[PDB]
Amino acid sequence: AGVNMEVDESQGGNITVEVTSMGNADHVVLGGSIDSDQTPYQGSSKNTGKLKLTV
Amino acid sequence: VSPVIGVILMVAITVILAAVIAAFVLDLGGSVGNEAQAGVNMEVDESQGGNITVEVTSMGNADHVVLGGSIDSDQTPYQGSSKNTGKLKLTVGDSVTINANNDGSVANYGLSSTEGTVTAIAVIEEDETRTQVASVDYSGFTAKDIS
Amino acid sequence: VSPVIGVILMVAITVILAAVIAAFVLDLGGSVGNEAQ
Amino acid sequence: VSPVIGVILMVAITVILAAVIAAFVLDLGGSVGNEAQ
Amino acid sequence: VSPVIGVILMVAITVILAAVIAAFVLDLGGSVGNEAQAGVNMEVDESQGGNITVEVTSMGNADHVVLGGSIDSDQTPYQGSSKNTGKLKLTVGDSVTINANNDGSVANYGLSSTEGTVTAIAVIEEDETRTQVASVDYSGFTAKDIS
Amino acid sequence: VSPVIGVILMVAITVILAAVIAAFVLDLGGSVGNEAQAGVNMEVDESQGGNITVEVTSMGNADHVVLGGSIDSDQTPYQGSSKNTGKLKLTVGDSVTINANNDGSVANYGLSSTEGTVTAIAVIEEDETRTQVASVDYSGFTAKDIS
Amino acid sequence: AGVNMEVDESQGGNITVEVTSMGNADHVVLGGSIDSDQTPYQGSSKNTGKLKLTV
Amino acid sequence: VSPVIGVILMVAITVILAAVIAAFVLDLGGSVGNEAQAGVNMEVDESQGGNITVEVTSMGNADHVVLGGSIDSDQTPYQGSSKNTGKLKLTVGDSVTINANNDGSVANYGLSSTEGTVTAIAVIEEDETRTQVASVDYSGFTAKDIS
């Protein structure tokens, strides 16, 4: 999959994740430092860090 | 005698296993597919509440362009070629304008959030390939009774 | 056999990477703006 | 028989190595940045 | 019987050898690294003994720029942001001037040879990658008590 | 009875032979090694007897760059970072100039032949891998008392 | 398995281990110079060098 | 005893079969060949009945360029370096002009059809490799007594 992740460093900072191509995958999930207990800052999600990202 | 018969049997096993492996590898060789290409122009007008205008300049190899991201696809976009709903099928020469302001009984003209990202997705219907070709960030908009 | 399958996989990688690069360069092509006079 | 199993195993190695290379090249494709004007 | 057992043993050998080869090739796949990029401006003033001024306009992907070549890093450079020593850490907006003339008890202001090349090297500290981004040749300088 | 005992003995032979073959093939699987990579810049100045300047822009995976070919490694090169002898250890940012002219009692400044090839060799000390990364041809030089 | 190990040489140095593919393995464990008595520097672990790494 | 003798005989069979397979695979390894490369310039002049001019700018690895397609190789082409017949051997610097008009007793100057395709083919005589390097479509020509 082609996933685009970029860091905004201004005023406390934000991380925006976008998917450009699915390749052969079904969905993209986030891992690492994710506190999946909490809802992410706006975006398509509005549910929780247990994302199912698609193009 | 034993070893010759063993050779025979192992050759049979080799034939069957080769058939299986051929099937697997030939399946794996046909799976590479297209990625959609299109030239989509998205621009933000920041004056007086703000508007977003999406235009397509080239189809590349895609069939149509659909919008994603912050789109409130429940509502009709602000004029443009659309006059139907955010479930657009954009093609070269089509112009659609999105607007966060509302109008009387009608809710927002396609934008629910006052800030966010709008993404343009190129679609190939033969494969169901969906590829993101453009995106633009908007902020500082407003949601009021007229535009 | 191995090298043919490797070719296939690298072509897939090429498609994905080309999509990413196309997105970047098309973003960069729309940014030139006006100066007021 | 040995060579067919070897082919299978080398195809598996190819898949893993292709994944690694895809990760590297996709990281390298997102790094180009702006210069201020 | 013998050939079947031989097949078994050769399959075991294949597994072990495949593990070894996988290890080697996966090591070889992670080694490609960065080359440093920076826009360094070096210019020579030829009047009255001559001076060399180094300025950095863009960091690219580097962390800092260090000087090499004919640098006498034992001595402090002629004014500029440095005022410490030829062991510079140049960043965007830093100006350092080098000078072959000396001053009283102080030896040359960074240039030992009257002619030679000064090179600018971009450094990435994560990898210790060092790449030459610019160089300039100087000649006809002088080494006297003042500049 | 005879054939069963023969089967047993041939299985033993198979075990020993498989051990030998495993040893051979595992030795053969560890031998693939590195080739050195470096970006070396070599240029010829053709004016007034001529000079050759060698500069390194990138180390790639090598440890240092050594010169070969027409090098008279008996003699010190013409200025540059070297000031020791043609047995150089070049690294990024190092400049060395070679010159066919001589000076008083000193023989040529690194070039014995008036025409020939100078080659740059990248060295990896872990393996003793030596790989040629660049070469340049020079001709029409001169050998006189000064440069 | 496809395991990615890289060394950061700046300011005392750090080692970051990431797994990109599980292949056929269940988990990845570290060996060699590991002082498994002590907790590793941040990352997903926060427990001890007796890791069970996954993609 | 039987199984040991069977092992011996199967080893002999293995030697013979390995020889056969080696012969086959070594034959298959020498067959990959060249494709011809050349830079051929073909342009159509549409004024006053029309003419086609073919020029070669680079030989690449080919020996000569021959024309194909709509060529009436029975007739001499309109001036140019040729003055012999459509069985050209074009090389860098050669210009040949083709023309569908005829002249008195002479038939067309190389073009029989009023519309069609002319193709340029690069030839390597060592292998007899023939590769198409360029083609151009022409239409709206005429066939009359003069040009």
mmCIF file of C-alpha atoms in Angstrom, chain E residues 1-3 5-7 9-10 13 16-17 20-21 24 28 35 68-70 113 115-117 119 121 130-133 135 137, chain F residues 6-7 10-11 14-15 18 21-22 25-26 29-30 32-34 43 53 55-60 79 81 91-95:
data_model
loop_
_atom_site.group_PDB
_atom_site.id
_atom_site.type_symbol
_atom_site.label_atom_id
_atom_site.label_comp_id
_atom_site.label_asym_id
_atom_site.label_seq_id
_atom_site.Cartn_x
_atom_site.Cartn_y
_atom_site.Cartn_z
ATOM 1 C CA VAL E 1 14.956 -47.338 0.345
ATOM 2 C CA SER E 2 17.981 -45.182 -0.495
ATOM 3 C CA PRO E 3 16.779 -42.518 -2.988
ATOM 4 C CA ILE E 5 15.937 -40.976 2.172
ATOM 5 C CA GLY E 6 18.397 -39.035 0.028
ATOM 6 C CA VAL E 7 15.553 -36.792 -1.113
ATOM 7 C CA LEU E 9 18.163 -35.281 3.494
ATOM 8 C CA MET E 10 18.643 -32.956 0.523
ATOM 9 C CA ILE E 13 20.010 -29.208 3.364
ATOM 10 C CA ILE E 16 19.300 -24.701 5.995
ATOM 11 C CA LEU E 17 20.926 -23.199 2.900
ATOM 12 C CA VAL E 20 21.587 -18.710 5.206
ATOM 13 C CA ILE E 21 20.900 -17.080 1.841
ATOM 14 C CA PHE E 24 22.649 -12.625 3.540
ATOM 15 C CA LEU E 28 22.292 -6.541 1.742
ATOM 16 C CA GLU E 35 23.833 11.551 0.400
ATOM 17 C CA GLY E 68 37.788 21.260 4.403
ATOM 18 C CA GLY E 69 40.729 21.457 2.026
ATOM 19 C CA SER E 70 43.267 24.202 2.674
ATOM 20 C CA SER E 113 48.632 28.105 1.941
ATOM 21 C CA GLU E 115 46.953 29.116 -3.042
ATOM 22 C CA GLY E 116 44.745 26.060 -2.811
ATOM 23 C CA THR E 117 41.193 24.763 -2.639
ATOM 24 C CA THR E 119 35.781 22.631 0.085
ATOM 25 C CA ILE E 121 31.202 19.346 3.237
ATOM 26 C CA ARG E 130 29.818 13.405 4.603
ATOM 27 C CA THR E 131 29.324 14.794 1.090
ATOM 28 C CA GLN E 132 31.176 17.582 -0.706
ATOM 29 C CA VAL E 133 28.713 20.239 -1.876
ATOM 30 C CA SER E 135 34.657 23.985 -3.627
ATOM 31 C CA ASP E 137 40.127 27.734 -5.775
ATOM 32 C CA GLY F 6 22.282 -53.691 1.474
ATOM 33 C CA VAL F 7 19.517 -51.126 1.922
ATOM 34 C CA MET F 10 23.361 -47.684 1.368
ATOM 35 C CA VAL F 11 21.337 -45.531 3.771
ATOM 36 C CA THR F 14 23.660 -41.642 1.964
ATOM 37 C CA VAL F 15 23.959 -40.024 5.388
ATOM 38 C CA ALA F 18 24.746 -35.849 2.453
ATOM 39 C CA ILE F 21 27.537 -32.186 0.236
ATOM 40 C CA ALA F 22 25.943 -30.010 2.921
ATOM 41 C CA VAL F 25 27.167 -26.104 -0.432
ATOM 42 C CA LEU F 26 27.110 -24.171 2.841
ATOM 43 C CA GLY F 29 26.748 -19.877 0.090
ATOM 44 C CA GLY F 30 28.792 -17.474 2.220
ATOM 45 C CA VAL F 32 29.399 -13.377 -2.110
ATOM 46 C CA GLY F 33 31.037 -10.085 -1.163
ATOM 47 C CA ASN F 34 30.878 -6.320 -1.547
ATOM 48 C CA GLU F 43 40.059 16.666 -13.841
ATOM 49 C CA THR F 53 43.524 17.478 -9.357
ATOM 50 C CA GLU F 55 38.738 15.286 -5.308
ATOM 51 C CA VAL F 56 36.302 12.914 -3.593
ATOM 52 C CA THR F 57 32.643 13.922 -3.343
ATOM 53 C CA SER F 58 31.104 10.795 -1.786
ATOM 54 C CA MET F 59 32.475 7.807 0.125
ATOM 55 C CA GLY F 60 29.591 5.497 -0.768
ATOM 56 C CA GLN F 79 50.419 20.650 -2.637
ATOM 57 C CA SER F 81 45.966 17.930 1.494
ATOM 58 C CA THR F 91 38.444 10.914 2.028
ATOM 59 C CA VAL F 92 35.595 13.315 1.331
ATOM 60 C CA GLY F 93 36.890 16.879 1.306
ATOM 61 C CA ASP F 94 40.496 15.948 0.500
ATOM 62 C CA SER F 95 42.152 17.599 -2.501
#
